[PDB]
């Protein structure tokens, strides 16, 4: 699919994505904080339709995500991400997509999630986060 | 040079 | 302060 | 079990640690680079023994890890960290332990280990690692 | 917390 | 004068600054790499007029600031930036304003100069850089 | 690669 | 002279120099903190003798170093480092050595003096230090 690179900012503030419940990841889009002023990033859709959007606001400075996880695995014959979850450290932004596939999860002791970069097509092909002090 | 840089962590999903 | 830190990730294994 | 922390250094030389093919990972040591010099850290011992060891030695400069992975499982009631395998740009020093369990990997796109922290009891309970630039 | 961090060097000027 | 804070970003790409050539530093804005594309700061004028501008276009990429240089001294009363220099990889965008005063630079040997603060009001009062790998 | 780096500054002195 | 290079450490415990109140600052020794743990670094010699010695022990969790400030001059042709002095969070360790020729200055915002290197013949030449947060 068409790869994309946020590339890196100050924080996170919103992260709306989609899903599909008997497929993956589909629409993902983040607005992040750069330097005290929100940041709206490049809106990453979809080939196709019939997602279910989820729009996650974080409590900005005092609500920030401790760990991201989610399941790879293979529908249709590509291997896509097919579910994702935002634990904070004050919720949990609950298993979104299906929960089937072999596991991940990036849980951060010391450090901040400052972007994102990966590829949809389809579904969310792959993905990988910066992190920063 | 002239570009700043961070670790990135991961690419899950396809190879 | 005084001493520098480092980006640390994870905690894998028991809680 | 007895926590220990390395701590974060100048990058890895070798990493010398323990399994049980039926258990999990014990013993754990690793000597870091230190500003150019090797760094011998402390070595964190299992209750027990019966273990086989493993030296994994980098070409230190130019090898460098890339790609840990491992399992985390359920041994004797306790969850522990069952196996463990480093991935290297020149090789891949296999997978030590059980492959069982929960899966976990972190690729590094952009980055490098540069130092380690965790638990070891009987086995490894939990570890974490540091990441540098 | 929450906020990115980086060194930041100075303050050249008035005190 | 009213403070300022530009933040941090990935580096820069032109740097727009006023001076007069028997008082001080004026006015100051520059516009920086927000990963890959420019991003415009906020302009921070003077409170008076009467300063001659000056517009430092690097080459982005292959061109960046390697040492930063001027003089600070008092000008009716008020200590403020009566000179500022950049040197890069490049070129040296030579003195502009009083080379008068106390002395200071800053040499980078590793590292990028990615955002500015400071205050202005009839002269540059004071700012510091924030700096990145 | 294999070695971390950070921010060195400066070079104060001689040349 | 001989150029040296200590590194980087966690921090910074005790500083060690050696000037003349007529020519410059001569011998430097650091002792850093390495996780926790004392560490010694390497006595960097004059190659002449007959200086004044002084021993700066920071408080080191509490105590650090927040702006180093010296002289830079010309003695005997080469142009050296004539003074230094290193103003921390609790006290200011005074000038060493001559406050004459042109002054520098790092006042720290936001980060540490975490190592040091430079050059040494008969006195300082040169010397740099590394930032980390
Ligand atoms: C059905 O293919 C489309 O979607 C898949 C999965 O999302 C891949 O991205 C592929 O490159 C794209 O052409
Ligand atoms: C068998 O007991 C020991 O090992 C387990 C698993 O390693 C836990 O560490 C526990 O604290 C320790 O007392
Ligand atoms: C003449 O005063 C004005 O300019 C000076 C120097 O620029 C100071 O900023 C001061 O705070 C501001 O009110
Ligand atoms: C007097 O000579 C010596 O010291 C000066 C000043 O320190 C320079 O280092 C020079 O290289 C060295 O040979």
């Given at each position: ?7 890196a ?10 899903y599909?419940?008997?497929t993956?990841?589909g ?5 992040y ?6 940041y ?5 859709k979809?080939?196709?339709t ?18 991201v996880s ?8 590509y291997?896509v991400?097919?579910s994702?979850?935002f ?12 929960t ?5 999860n ?21 993905f990988?986060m910066?992190?920063?002090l | 040079?002239g570009?700043?840089?961070?670790v990135?962590?991961?690419?899950w999903?396809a190879?």
């Amino acid at each position: 699919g068409k790869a994309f690179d946020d590339g890196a900012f100050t924080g996170i503030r919103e992260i709306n994505l989609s899903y599909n419940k008997e497929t993956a990841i589909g629409d993902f889009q983040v607005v992040y904080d750069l330097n005290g002023s929100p940041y709206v990033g490049q809106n990453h859709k979809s080939f196709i339709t019939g997602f279910t959007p989820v729009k996650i606001s974080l409590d900005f400075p005092s609500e920030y995500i401790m760990e991201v996880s989610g399941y790879t695995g293979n529908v249709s014959g590509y291997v896509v991400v097919r579910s994702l979850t935002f634990k904070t450290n004050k919720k949990t932004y609950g298993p979104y997509g299906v929960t089937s596939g072999t596991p991940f999860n990036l849980p951060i002791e010391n450090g901040l999630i400052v972007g994102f970069k990966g590829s949809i097509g389809y579904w969310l092909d792959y993905f990988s986060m910066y992190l920063s002090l | 040079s002239g570009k700043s840089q961070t670790v990135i962590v991961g690419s899950w999903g396809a190879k």
